[PDB]
C-alpha cells in the first residue's frame, strides 16, 4: 500500500510505500531528505500544505517571552530527531502568525496538538517533561482511527 508525505523543504507531495525499507528517501522534486528529524516552522503559507502529510504531525503553538514555551522547545526538538521517520514536528509562532493563531482558536500557550490525516486527535494543555510527552504521543498514536 501507498502513502503521501510532504517535503518539508519544497512542500512537494512524495508518494512512498507505507512499509519502508529505510528512512533515506529523498524528495523527488528537490533531493531533500524526507525524514531529517528537524523541527519545522510553519507559516500561513505552509501549514495547510504540511497538514496534507499522511504522517502524524504534532504542532506546538508558542509565543516569544513564554516560560513554558522556552522550556518545551528543546524537548520538542530532541523528540523530533528521535522520531524522524514516524512523526513530524511543527511550530507556529502565534505572534508571527496571528491569523493562524485565530483560525486554530488558540486559548493558551503553549498549545500542543496532534493531527492525523486531517483530524485533530488530542491536545496537551501545557508544556510537560520529555518522558510524559513521549508517553502522550505513544498513547495517542496507538489509539484507533
Measured from the CB atom, the residue of 9 and 123 that comes closer to Zn ion is 9
Stretch that binds Zn ion, among 9-17, 33-41, 43-51, 108-116 (CB under 5 A): 9-17
Inter-residue contact 33 to 87 (CB < 8 Å): no
Q: Which of 3, 12, 39, 63 binds Zn ion (CB under 5 A)?
A: 12
In this complex, which beta carbon is closest to Zn ion, that of residue 32 or of residue 49? Answer: 32
Could you tell me the smallest distance in angstroms from the CB atom of residue 13 to Zn ion?
A: 9
Residue 128 CA to residue 113 CA, distance in Å, equals 13
Rg, C-alpha atoms of the chain: 15
6, 42, 55, 69: which is the annotated catalytic residue? Answer: 69
Based on the residue annotation, tell me whether 62 is a catalytic residue of this protein: no
Interactions with Zn ion, residue window 16-35 (CB under 5 A): 27, 29-30, 32
Q: Which is nearer to Zn ion, 47 or 106 (CB)?
A: 47
The reply to whether 69 belongs to the active site is yes
Instruction: Tell me how far, at minimum, the Cβ of 7 lies from Zn ion, in Å.
Output: 3
Only one of the segments 8-16, 46-54, 71-79, 105-113 lies at the binding site for Zn ion (rule: CB under 5 A); that segment is 8-16
49 binds Zn ion (CB under 5 A): no
Q: Which single residue is written with the C-alpha cell 486554530?
A: 104
Secondary structure in 3-state letters for the chain:
CEEEEECCCCCCEEEEECCCCCCCCECCCCCCECCCCCCEECCCCCHHHHCCCCCCEEEEEECCCCHHHHHHHHHHHHHHHHCCCCCEEEEEECCCCHHHHHHCCCCCCCEEEEEECCEEEEEECCCCCHHHHHHHHHHHHHCCC
| Active site members | 66, 69
Q: Site residues (CB under 5 A) for Zn ion? A: 7, 9-10, 12, 27, 29-30, 32
Amino acid at each position: 500500500n501507498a502513502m503521501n508525505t510532504v517535503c518539508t523543504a519544497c512542500m512537494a507531495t512524495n508518494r512512498l510505500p507505507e512499509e519502508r525499507i529505510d528512512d533515506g528517501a529523498k524528495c523527488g522534486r528537490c533531493g531533500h531528505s524526507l525524514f531529517d528529524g528537524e523541527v519545522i516552522n510553519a507559516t500561513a503559507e505552509t501549514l495547510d500544505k504540511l497538514l496534507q502529510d499522511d504522517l502524524p504531525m504534532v504542532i506546538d503553538f508558542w509565543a516569544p517571552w513564554c516560560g513554558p514555551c522556552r522550556s518545551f522547545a528543546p524537548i520538542f526538538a530532541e523528540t523530533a530527531a528521535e522520531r524522524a521517520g514516524k512523526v513530524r514536528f511543527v511550530k507556529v509562532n502565534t505572534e508571527a502568525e496571528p491569523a493562524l493563531s485565530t483560525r486554530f482558536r488558540i486559548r493558551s500557550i503553549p498549545t500542543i496538538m496532534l493531527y492525523r490525516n486531517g483530524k485533530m486527535i488530542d491536545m496537551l494543555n501545557g508544556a510537560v517533561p520529555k518522558a510524559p510527552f513521549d508517553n502522550w504521543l505513544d498513547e495517542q498514536l496507538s489509539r484507533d482511527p
